[PDB]
Assembly symmetry: D2
Homo-oligomer: 249 residues x 4
């Protein structure tokens, strides 16, 4: 077979072989050497080793190589084993994160009067976010358009409720499918959450378990909401930071 | 002291979920008031359903040990830990022997590959040229009914030809009709072939290709000639990625 | 060939072919049809499934069993991913339990007079006991034979030290190899360890971290020690606990 | 505030390791005492060389950012944990690639075996009958000398035969000698064989033995008769798990 065509498949290179000359390195047995090699190019063996692997021995001896390429498998799975126990280490090292996460989450006491939000009202609370943010600038009378609230009122049933909306001047028309919620005048303990939305809840568990009791604050069955703003870049980006406004006495 | 709706906001759950949890005697608390100190003893539940563990083996733990004994609740999940890895460890060895059985069904037919001998005269085939099968066969299908002079339109040719490839996807033609742009036409000469019927997909014929030239010619007893190889896509072929396909590979012979 | 020969090669039972009689499941064509079955049943499949999955077929036909076996790889593989995710979370879950026992690691203040310990002493720590426990009743005149002590004198260089001994009435001879150490009188804060031996240092940072400071104690550079009584049956059994006696002012 | 000695102690490390760390300016705090708030900073530094993170990567993570900010190091760790499982995955699909070459290795000799044709008369040999090879293929060797009337001593046999299995690893003997105890004798009759000098190991034969009755007799055209087959050890054989040794196998032929 000629030199130009003996470049089988599928990505060359031709001098691939001319390379494979120098002091080293259509016969039918002048292939299985290449066949074995080609993967090989799946183990990444230097060539100089792949010369040592010439006739001293061996030429072919698929005999040896069956134990050889699983002796490796022994090495390469020990490589996988070492990096997995490194990974298992990691998953535990990423626990010291959560509880330093929280011990630094300080509370600031904020009193804010009654204001009026307009937005969409509630299976999930994320969805509304999926559904609402094409309807952003459909609302006029904005104080600050960057901030948005995730209102949650405690009904005497008791069962959920949430509204994704914006603080707006009261007196403007509300679009179809939206609702006007009037947040009353409350005074809040504000926690800065630094994480994603599903682990906002595990911050809520830290609040109502001890983080309020270490500063002597008592929780209040009022209107909880989370303060979104410019320091917010995604619900599952583990770098967003929100403020959780939690009512107190 | 908190209420059933605040815990729902805390845990992202249903009020019926806890109203059910009260009925069993699991997590009890008209004035339903829960203690903030038992918020963890609950999350030490809502962390086990997330580990599909049934909801009365818990309630059996609640009084053997253990739900409230923290040195006991890591023994239980470290056993569930190692249970899951051995499940994973079973199924990763399931995967190891899942591949070694994707090579022996590889090389089974390759041996059982059928072979005809056809000597075919020189013919002309117009088409497009040169990244793989599909990089040239879609930019064709919409340009196959604009080709005139076709001998058989239900057969297509994939020609294999300094030393670079000259792969041409085209149609056998009767001469005297012209070729569009930027189509080309290739002179395939009169030669003798070993046609091997391949039953599979486009990525896995290139192993059907090195198999012949490997030991398949010899064992069949024929010698390769330096000419022009090519694949033959008959009717019997239905898509380059359909596995139940059937193509032909024509290989020059001395 | 015979129903004998038909019973060779594969690690086969006679019950398996009496099995396959009235089910519907003597020529070298019946050699791979019955060899792909010992190829999936190597991957935990059903059987009656692949019954008529071969009277349609494929009987053999490896064009299909390709997508199928890659189908099955998917399925598996999905399983293996799904259960790593559980282990990942599952790790995270053992954090809380880590701290719940730390938060419940109460200090005890204990004043103990100067007592006499003798055993072995010293670039490692854990290998010291496997040589000593054998030599355990060599020692004579011990107060409580059940309690070992892992002493760690504080040297002022600071070079370590460490002794694994018993407490005996002074004046008893001391087997070759071991020495006698006198710890002085001190008052200590005692923290009970629930866990294993490489976990012991995990408590040592928490103690010298915040656990002394909230309890309003100051620690003093002296002779600390680890105390093993029964409630200890293995440096790896995770249910033994050791009382870490730390000096305080 | 603390002492270099008890610090070290609580981290279960050495003191020269902390004087290691100080000299650079990394963890820099004659009576140098350190405050306890630097403990958790070191439980985060010592937790990074368990990840084999260079001891300079950091420091630049020190006065730059960011070693003690709990959300921008979960970033770090999140990446590093990606490329860690990205490296798993490389290999993890590579040892799916090799572990699928576990069959390609095979068939190449299997196709390039050899088969002589022998006709042999009935013989006899004895040892122990039927726990695999090694559970019997080893009791012996200390009992090879008990037999007398060895025919060729460099040659050992493993016979296979209402119906089930029936191995026996013997030697060929001239008749008229005492067979030990509880050793026994076996008589294979005069029959037709084809000999495949396998070049592998003893666990490796069971599918080379599977290959020959599968198709190799049909390719070579031979056919088997309901008799007794066996395997032949010679100067060839070197070890039951020795790869490079070649062993021969006798199967009945018509």
């Amino acid at each position: 077979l000629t030199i130009g065509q003996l470049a089988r498949i599928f990505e060359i290179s031709t001098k691939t072989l001319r390379h494979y000359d120098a002091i080293g390195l259509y016969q039918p047995e002048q292939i299985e050497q290449l066949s074995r090699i080609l993967a090989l190019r799946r183990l990444d063996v230097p060539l100089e080793a792949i010369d040592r692997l010439k006739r001293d021995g061996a030429l072919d001896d698929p005999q040896r190589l069956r134990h050889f390429l699983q002796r490796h498998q022994h090495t390469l799975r020990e490589e996988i084993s070492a990096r997995q126990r490194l990974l298992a280490e990691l998953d535990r090292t990423l626990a010291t994160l959560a509880h330093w996460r929280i011990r630094n989450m300080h509370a600031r006491i904020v009193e804010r009067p009654a204001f009026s939000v307009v937005g969409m009202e509630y299976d999930t609370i994320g969805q509304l976010w999926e559904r609402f943010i094409p309807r952003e600038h459909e609302i006029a009378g904005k104080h600050d358009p960057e901030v948005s609230y995730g209102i949650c009122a405690q009904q005497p049933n008791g069962e959920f409720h949430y509204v994704a909306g914006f603080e707006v001047q009261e007196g403007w028309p509300v679009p179809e499918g939206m609702v006007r919620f009037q947040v009353p005048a409350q005074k809040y303990a504000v926690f800065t959450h630094k994480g994603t939305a599903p682990q906002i809840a595990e911050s809520f568990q830290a609040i109502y378990s001890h983080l309020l009791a270490e500063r002597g604050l008592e929780p209040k069955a009022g209107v909880d909401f989370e303060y979104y703003d410019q320091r917010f870049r995604g619900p599952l980006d583990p770098n967003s930071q929100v403020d959780l406004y939690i009512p107190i006495y």
